[model samples]
Target: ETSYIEDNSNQNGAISLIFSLKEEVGALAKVLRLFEENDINLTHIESRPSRLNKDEYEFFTYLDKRTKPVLGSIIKSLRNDIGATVHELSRDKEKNTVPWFPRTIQELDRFANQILAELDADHPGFKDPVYRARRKQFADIAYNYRHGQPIPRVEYTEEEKQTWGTVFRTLKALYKTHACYEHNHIFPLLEKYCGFREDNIPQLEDVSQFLQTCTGFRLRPVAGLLSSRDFLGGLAFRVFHCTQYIRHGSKPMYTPEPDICHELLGHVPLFSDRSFAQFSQEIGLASLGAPDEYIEKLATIYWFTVEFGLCKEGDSIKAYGAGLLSSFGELQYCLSDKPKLLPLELEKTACQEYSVTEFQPLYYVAESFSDAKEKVRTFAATIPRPFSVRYDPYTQRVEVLDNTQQLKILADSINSEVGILCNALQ
Candidate 1:
């Protein structure tokens, strides 16, 4: 049995050797001997025969590179003497790690249960099997949902509507005073037409459509919370997956999973603003196929900026954070004199630990929406990725750059875009 944590974020750590030695009686022994002669201390290795190539053996090995200063010489010896093709199955010089995040939009639903908060005894509806069953039932709706299908229309009962009303009453007044410029500007429109009232639960379809009309962003119904990696993937495409479920009536104000209340009241309105929408999408774009360590950093970027973010309102700071705007008490505490407030810098803010308990001891404030967007763009350029991707809205596709063939796809798309612009000018 082998034990390793696959955290490959750097190239300076352990080297994972993936290769097939020559097909010979003593091939493995010969390669093992080569490592020893070069003073290499291998940590672990697993061997398997190639499924497609008959008798072609594959070895996945972990070794400490510290023992060997001359890696090229050892590689040369292994390749020349043993007839091997060497490749690293791992990197990031650390003892064990290299998380493989999802590569596509379809991969987003694999962690269906992870999207939902873990059911706990302390949860308000912990003993309610009826409620728990409904949660799982909804998760399946999201899990099976495909891109073109209608987002499931959920019918809310009086009990659920009552809970929605209660939450609406609590935070509606605070927005004019404590919420941001972008949020207040969009809030009134939501109330007038998109059903932001103290009585009825606004349907996801209505809210989704309103957001699409305002900006190109579309909201998909979510069964549970998505992993940081998957959520950002959605953001990159100007798509959002939101929950249709409500919190238990007893605890309407504060269930953690970004419920419909949080989704609409907190995050939805901001997406209506071009600057904020672009800002959110910029953070999403930087996260595409990044290393495991970088995924954590990008998620932190989202947390400090979107979730618990605050910004300067003239001399005083205001709430732009969905986390702060979603709840009355949280907004009060965040705007209150109690929590430590600091100007957000990615270097410092990225490392700030999220408190496991409610009311984080530290909160980061951004200067303005555009300023924060520029700062994120500068920071994203520094992240490492093999290639860049462009979200081609014309085709609703993600175009991978570099391969000249794919460049044609982008060129054609751009050509059509220009034609539409020229016709408009005419």
Candidate 2:
């Protein structure tokens, strides 16, 4: 298993806690309210089976904050309520493995500090301008030119290489079955576009080559999460991110965030296929051009499609969404017959509301990759243009609305069955 040291890479003070409940009612409800009261953003929440006891359950929650003390208070309060037991549930801090071929080439700065810090308690000259410049370069490649920073290459430890090998092997195993396996399709296209090797995992520089080759696409390495605009822009330029870490053993099946496992394993494979790639590109373009009102609408599509999309393969329904595919919990949940499945209709999907805390109660089903591609292509014609006006003539009201609220309402109704599942889980 890959074990990382506590990663302080994200200075934003984000923390994730997993609460193992004794089947307590209102336990999660109370905890959620506490987070809201403190103005803590809930990044995600999902229920996982007790690794110790199959019949028992555990609720995993992630929150964003600027300080550890604030998180500590919430943890303390949650522990007192419903006798909640706290598990760190954070990413391994020490496992800084490098992929054979990283999609971006600029993580060397942060890795340098980590190495120095580990070697000496009070290290000086670590933050020199040269290093900073190199780090920025790395960020630029990682973020696809959005960050415009330089990052140098660092040597990968053997353990890190092992993690990469394991993840790649797992991906190779799924190539015959997994539709989006990157090796099959994306590798060739990316190579053709910018010249990356397909036979084996390429280095960070190689990945950057393809990224830089794009006409409008550029990379940026971020401290933590991608803002809505950054993510949208990635789509507009066909620039995908390359996380420097790898997921191993237990980590592969479950993780709250998108690690190398989620990025490469879940997303890259699909990037290999043509239709799936087009669908992803379309979603990005749609979000990039979306009016403020329909921004949420674009998000809805992303939630159901890129994050939690599913499709029929032969006789069985399989995962295509990165969130579900990389997730240990949702992967199982998605395939279960218990959850409600709805057809993928832009009208129905773009307006559906969702909670970030759990496995999606409803999944939008696509007949085929073609169906997904067509839906995305038609979004421009079907969706309203920016600054489009709306009026209530009877009341002599001009709401300055862009997207229709009724569209959202209908989409919500189609996904209402998911609410039932949430209730049942509660």
Candidate 3:
């Protein structure tokens, strides 16, 4: 584990910084306090009349953690007073590049790319040009989707519905006997509300709105597998980036990557459950400005818990992970004595590797959703980030909790809510 402050000990080692300010923005104080004061003395920073906009200029600087303990306050003051947009860590061209974490939801899709390329030999839809074009059609919808706009609804052709119908019947039959308690509870509700059924493919717009009412979770469409940072980043704001495309018509039973079936059947129902929803967001919250390596660790935890996890009902292990719940073979096989079953230990499972092409060889089982929630919360507390984040409900924004003024506003908001609850109870 790399300590944020210790990276400066070696020669040619410095944490880079970049932020934009208005062309006329205050430099007289900022330059004096951080640079001339020798707190974060420049290893040579440039304030090139770098015009991000004709009206704005950016200051690029570098620092080491060993030299300053008030780095958090440094960021707070930049954001607080000068109101400069403190861009992510600056990358030294000759040294190393840490992916700049996007602070807002809209910037996330800027990293989005193709979810489906024509497959290798194993993929069921590998050789079909018509099928490939269909993927592009679906991908285009997700590609064009923006944060506030309605998710584009796809009208599945009869043949497409045929594929979904078969998968639906197969997975639904497995639900009662194998799926976890929370999943089972929400499955029927999905049927009534989101039109989860054998013949009908539910629309993202309908389902996203329905999920919003259930647990404050909502969905946005994506092309496919997003970068770990981009995917986890969305979770901070209670957004699930979904793929609108379905699997190939040829093989309805198996999919190498996440398709509509994997998301809607495996992941969707769980999102509507209160405890599971909260658990999902905790992992996302942990990802905000997390060090690059820690992001991988958090993503690994997600693969085990949200993607392929099992949970104990009484003595028997039940399927809670979407990966197993969506696949007929894995769903039945996971509960059988074929694979290794282990407790859902975050530290251990995070480093453990598994195959994407085959069913997971090892499984991590949770006691319950609330138990998993507590474990995730405890685990996230260890990740390194300067400031924690809270999702604002009314505004649909993530507010960083580092400054006192922001905390005061937050405190006043809580007081108002508590007072209302107190009167309602009386």
Candidate 4:
């Protein structure tokens, strides 16, 4: 695994620099002093361990134009002030990289594409377009649900599980106290929609039945994840792909991929509500009508509104976004003022820049679910055929790449006739 930093037009105006620091406890303190002496105001600083150097660490520091000059001077003074080795790295734009072990939206998109292709190869549901679409959406959702760790199934030791479990119980309790705790809201809704259940595991017939009830949607069950096309198609049909695994009890808060928790726990509750459900459905439909050229913007709307939304609750802001709701650190950060707040204006929110792998610094606010519903409705009604990029829930379709991609693997556990044959032979 490698940490990458990206440079863009924005970098020309202001550069974001992240430092990799050795594991010296006071290195940061001294670095801060150097900045102070140089009159450089740090924009942002985050510390993460270096994957390359197990014992060393990385510090991400961002400085605005106000302190750019001072920052340059401090880098020159690093050795004298903090006895530190400082090097300036050139920023690259074409290659996707981010500070302090960050993943770019492009990486997530690539992962989604690759996972979709893998899912197609593993479980060919292209015979049924509905299933194909669901697979893609489910994969996309999974891709966005976790941070740092892109895919879900990183085998963890018992100690890691214990840490995850502690976090899970705490969040579960917190959700009950501060947020809605109804099972029917998120989890049950997704289960019912995706044809998954607590006890039944995952069955095609059940999912098909659920799809049938979903405003005439159809379903196809791919072995794993979905491609972008499949995801779009699934949304258009009110169908959604699903993962078969559930996080172990030991790692309750850990989200590897969209698994049941990210799908059901993170997203399903909102589905139970009319406005959010409609909004989701509309997103699929809109995407279906939209042109591939414009699909990115529609995706941004989903990213800000459905995945990571915030709302003004009288005097304070509260979260309605599934991302924040399921994340403990993010929840705290969203409520904290230490970071900047980018308001939730629809036009701006839809076009606002974002990176998928990190905690959101900006969020879109809707006055209410109805308000969001209205915006979606307007987008659907006015948008014309084969959208530049449709964001509609019901118009997207997932086509299989080929026949080999659809093969299914099954295991037989019972053999009644074999027992009789064995007795006769004996």
CA lDDT of each prediction against the hidden true structure = 0.71, 0.51, 0.73, 0.48
Candidate 1: what lDDT?
Answer: 0.71
lDDT of 3 by residue, 269-388 (tens): 899888888888888877766776677788778888898899898878888888898899999999999989888888897788876667788999888888887887787778775555
| Candidate ranking (lDDT, best to worst) | 3, 1, 2, 4
Q: What is the TM-score of each candidate against the true structure?
A: 0.70, 0.48, 0.75, 0.45
Off by over 4 Å in 4: 1-114, 117-168, 177-225, 247-256, 312-316, 380-426
TM-score, cand. 4 vs. native: 0.45
1-426: candidate 2 lDDT, tens digit per residue = 111122233444234454455445775567667776776555555555443333445554544335345766777786675565553422222122111110112212222222201112222313344433444443444544333444335564454455556655554455445443333445456545433232333444444544444332333334334544335435544556456543333333444435555665566556545566567766765653344445566667777887788886667777778776565456667777888998899887877767665667889988777788788767745554332222222322121222344346446766787888888998
Cα lDDT tens digits for candidate 1, 1-426: 111112323233334454564468887777767776766644454565543245566565555446436556866776676666554323332333322333234433333334424477887888888888877777777777766566777788898889988889889878888899889999999999888899878887788889889988888777765566667767887788788788888888777556788889999999999999989988888776566567777788888888889998889888899888988988988888998888889877766677535677888889988889888878877776544555656545453343443456567779999999999999
Q: What is the C-alpha RMSD of each candidate to the true structure, in Å?
A: 11.1, 19.7, 8.9, 24.3
Best by lDDT: 3
Q: What is the C-alpha local distance difference test score of candidate 3?
A: 0.73
Number of clashing residue pairs, candidate 4: 48
- Top-down TM-score ranking: 3, 1, 2, 4
TM-score of the candidate numbered 1?
0.70
